[PDB]
Structure formats: structure tokens, C-alpha cells
Amino acid sequence: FAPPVNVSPLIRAGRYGALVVGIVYGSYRFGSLQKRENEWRVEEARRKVIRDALNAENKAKATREEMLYLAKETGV
Amino acid sequence: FGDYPAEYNPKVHGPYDPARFYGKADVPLGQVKLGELSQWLGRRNKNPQAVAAAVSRGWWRWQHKYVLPRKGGIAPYIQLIVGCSIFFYAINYGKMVAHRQRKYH
Amino acid sequence: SLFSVFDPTSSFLSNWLSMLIPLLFMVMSFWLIPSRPQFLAKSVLMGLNREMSLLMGPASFGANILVIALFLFILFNNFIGLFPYIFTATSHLAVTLSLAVPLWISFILYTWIKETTNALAHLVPLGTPAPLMPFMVLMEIISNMIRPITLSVRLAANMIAGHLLLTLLGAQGTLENLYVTSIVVFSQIILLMLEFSVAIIQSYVFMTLMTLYASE
Amino acid sequence: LATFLKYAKVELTPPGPADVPKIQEGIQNLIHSAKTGKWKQVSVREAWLNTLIVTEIAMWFFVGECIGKGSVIGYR
Amino acid sequence: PRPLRPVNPGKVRVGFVPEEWFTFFYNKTGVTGPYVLGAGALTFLLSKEIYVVEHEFYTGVAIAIMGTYGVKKFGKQIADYADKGIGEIEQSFKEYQDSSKI
Amino acid sequence: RIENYKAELGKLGQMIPFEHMTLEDFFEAFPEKVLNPDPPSPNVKKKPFKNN
Amino acid sequence: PWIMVFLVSMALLWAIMTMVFFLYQPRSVSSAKGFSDRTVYLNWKW
């Protein structure tokens, strides 16, 4: 290709400055959102338990009614 | 409807080159010094016929660069496929965003 | 979401712009001696025109270009539609029905208007007995009636099945496991070679069947 | 690909420590271009490019954010 | 002026990207300038999930592999067939001109 | 006839070569062309029409 | 939107038809060998 060109020092300084700022901002935001995800999982565990209990009871009763209706249709 | 544009003069401009703009010599947008960029934008008319003419002139410039030469390659066709796939992804922006893998990002 | 490829209701600029794609991929001719793609496109079109002229006959002057344009329309929508985010127009039954029904009507109505008694004699296939003659008449009527359905279905349902089989393999292509990804990509290479061949074969099938229906 | 590695060594390296007074003289010149002019005398090709370059600096910032957060696709 | 027909089309790097895009940055960012701009762009699209890796990304990858293999295997044969036809046409036109002079 | 042949020879000598010929300069130098009130074909050839 | 689909599909099929209609190579292979026998010498008197 063409002979190499040294980049402008301002471009290199801003690029690596943005790289450093990106690393520390990524570390800070990941540490911030990890606690938020942990709290969300804490409340979602209780929400999952309540939803699972109610949905399993509703599904079991609906399954019983559906099997009774199909036995009525088939006559067995 | 098909006819040459009214600025085309076959006794002055030679044979018809559809990628060439035969009107008055306006400054191309590349070399506008951006202090007169609003004046340049106001100078060009925004008529749909002029817009379709500028699109057709650009498409003929691309044809002249990548297809109309004799030993042309498959680079123009890959450019069309990638340009159509990017455009049709931007059209379906919601249909692909609504099936993401991560939440926060 | 599996079937989300077949949702034309996309944005303000809808997926009906997938029909302007053949205007981009059609060769434009400027110089007297053609380029490589113009010559290749013209050579393929001349070859198919010579193949269809055998089945057409001399009383079908308009069938030289009317079936070639339909072949290129179907071929470009089937071929450039298989690229990933590009919407496939001929997957939907509406576009294939829009291509098959009007030309089939232009064959049936024009044959009935032009040669009525010749068509009525053409109902009997030259040797079947008279007790089987009304059955052959009903068979011919039904077989001509389900002609445009069997073209639109054979194009739309084949393209829908050909892209759903790719979408099923794409959805199982996890990125964490490189082995599963490589299996998916290799199987999709086999499947996409099959789909490109099926796309060109189905466009040639439609051109052949429209030529045979035009001549008969 | 060895020449690409050579160009990466030449061009993707941090700036020299001695050009810090120089780049500030450049940066204040940008401030001198932020108040008086030197930007309404910029060809749109050049202006296009200057923007393009900057987008590259911001993309290096997001690469550094990917480095700081680990994985590329999201915050895992 | 009269339009001219070049023998070779415009220069293209990486299959389809025009070379003028890569040489546009040479005044400022050297040779790896555009390449790292495209790398940062692809990383940013996959970072903020603007480009979502869906079931069609692997279709696009398989198409890219098939296209590279097919072009590298049949590009010379197809270009030779086309240039043979263009030479035959130009030869026929030259033979027509010579026969008319004779 | 000699004057006509010399005029035709000079005109063909002065024609633009086919390598640099656009598809309209060819149709200017060969005015048969293909027109709207003309026997058509998708392959506008020397024998796709009539001949029956 | 079957009506707009039908109209756009048929307008595009007609547009493809008029794109193919101008896709041909005009071969100027009209040989002028007939002029080698068109000239007839002047008949004498016998």
C-alpha cells in the first residue's frame, strides 16, 4: 500500500483519552447495573414463586375441567 | 416520459452522457466552504423532478464507474446486495430490535 | 420471531419496495460493444427466447417478451430475496396470484372468443369414447380452472417453505457455542445452494408453463 | 497481514510525552476556531472528513467501553 | 468532452468497498484509519445491539462464504466467456468495416 | 457512381470507431434504428418479424 | 392492500418488459459484397 503516515498528536491523544474514559465508564456502569440486576432478580424470584403457584393451580384446575369436558364429549 | 433534458445541446455538448449535468456550472457540494452552505442549499431547487434527475445522474455515475467499463467485476453487484440489505434492515429496525439478546447495553 | 420475515407491515416505508429491486439489478446499456454483465444477461435472455420459440409458434408474436419479463421478475424476487434482510415479494401468495391469474385469463377468454368450436373439439383428446366424453370435458374444465392456483401456490408456498427452513436453522445458531454455529453455517450453505437452485428452477418452471398455456 | 501489524505499531500507538504542550497549543487553536472562525472556511469534503475522524474517536471510546465491560454484546 | 470507456472499473478493496473511501482518510489517519473506523463501527453496532444478531445474520454469513467460494472458483471462467463474446462482436464490426472498404 | 462511392468511402473513413462508439452515435451513423412505428421484437433482429 | 400490490406488480412487470425490449445488440454485419457485382459494363453493338 501507501507509505505509512504518523497520525496527528491531537488525534492520538483524544483517541486514547476516549479509550481510557471508555474503560472507566464501562467499569463504573457495569458495577452500577450489577446491583440493579441483583435487586431485580431478588424481587423477580418472589414474583416468579407467586406467579408459578397461581398459574400451576389455575392450569391444574383448567386441565381437570378440560379432561372432564372431553370425557363428556367422548362418552367414556 | 423520455426526452433529453432541455439543457442538453447535441451541437455543443457532443454525445449524450446521462451521468453529466448539462445545466449551469454550480459549485459541487464537496468544495463548498460551509460558510455558504445554506446559500448552496437554497440555490438548488427541491423539485421532485430535479431530485429524480439528481438521483438518476448519480446512478449513472455509479454505472459509469463500476458496470459500464468493459472488464467490470462483481463489486457493483455486491455493493447493490449490501446496500439493499442495509436499507431493508433500517426499514425493519423495529422488527429486529424487538428480538434483542441483551437488555441494558 | 420465526414468521417475522413475512410481515410487510414494517415502517412508514413498507416492504413493498422489494418490487423496485429488479429495476436496480437490470443491466443498462450505454456503449455499443456491451460490458460483461450486459452481454451475460443478453446471452441468457437470447438462450431462453430461443428455447421458448420452439414451444410458442408463429401465431404468438407477443409471447417472446411477455414471458421473458415474467421470468426475470420472478427470478429477481426469488434470488435477491434470499439475501438476509431483504423482503421476498414472491413469498406472498398475493404477488404470485397477481402474476398468474391475469395471463391465465388472457389465455382462456381469448381462446374461447377466438376459436369456440375448435376449443370444444379440443376438449375431447382425440380417441376417448363418448360415454367418457362428458367426464373428459369436466376434467379439462377443472384442470384449466386450477391452472393459476397451481402456479401461484407452487411459487409462493415453495418460497415460504424455503425461507422458513432457513429461519429454523438460523434460530438454533447460538453464538456462545462455536461448534453449533459452524454446523448451522455449513448446513445453511447446503440449504442456500439448494434454495438458489430451486429459485432459478421455479422461475424457469413458471416461464415454461406460461409459454405452454399461451401456445395452447 | 504482517504489514498491517507494522502499520498498527506505527499508527495505533499512544502519543509522545513531549507533545503535550504542543497539542494544547493545538487545542487552544481549536478554541481560537471555536470563537472567531476557521470552520466557515471549511470545504464540505474536508468538513465531512473531520466529522468522520471524530466518529472514529467516539468509536474508540465505545471499544474501550467494551473492554471495560468485558463482553461485546451488551453488559452480559 | 467525449465520454471514454476505461478497460478497468474503479478500484475496490475488501470485495465491495470502494478504494476512494479508504484513500479519503490518508491525509489524516494513515492506512489503518478507515479500517479501524469500520472495526469500531461494527463493534459499536454489536455493542449497543443496534445490529441485532438474529437468525438472518448466519444466513448472511453463509451467503458470504458461498459467494466468496463461487466467485473465486468461477470468476475467471465467466469473465473469459464474456470477454470472448465482446471480442467476437468487436471483431465482427471490424470485419464489416474492412469488407466495406474493400 | 464514382462520386457516390468516394463519398461513402470518405464517410466510413470519418466515422467514429466502434470501440469509442456510444449506442446513439451508432444509431446516428446507421439510421435504421428501432422506432415506435416500426416492426418490433425483444431481440430487435433482422428476421424476428413477418416472414410468414 | 391487494389492489396496490396488483397495480405495483403489474407496473413493475411492464417496466421489466420495456427494459428487456431495449436489451439487444445491434449487429452491423451488413456486408457490401453485392456491390462487387452490381456494376454492369456498357453493352456494345453487334
XYZ file of C-alpha atoms in Angstrom, chain D residues 41-68:
28
model
C -13.900 28.381 5.653
C -14.009 24.536 5.577
C -14.813 22.651 2.322
C -17.629 20.139 2.913
C -15.312 17.307 1.811
C -12.854 18.350 4.492
C -15.707 19.016 6.947
C -17.192 15.613 6.118
C -13.863 14.027 6.893
C -13.241 15.980 10.083
C -16.610 14.672 11.333
C -15.734 11.209 10.099
C -12.431 11.238 12.017
C -14.223 12.335 15.182
C -16.775 9.477 14.855
C -13.697 7.234 14.837
C -12.574 8.704 18.176
C -16.044 8.092 19.622
C -15.966 4.532 18.286
C -12.630 4.026 20.055
C -14.421 5.238 23.186
C -17.083 2.560 22.732
C -14.402 -0.060 22.064
C -12.850 0.968 25.371
C -16.278 0.674 26.950
C -16.454 -2.866 25.554
C -13.014 -3.558 27.043
C -14.099 -2.201 30.423
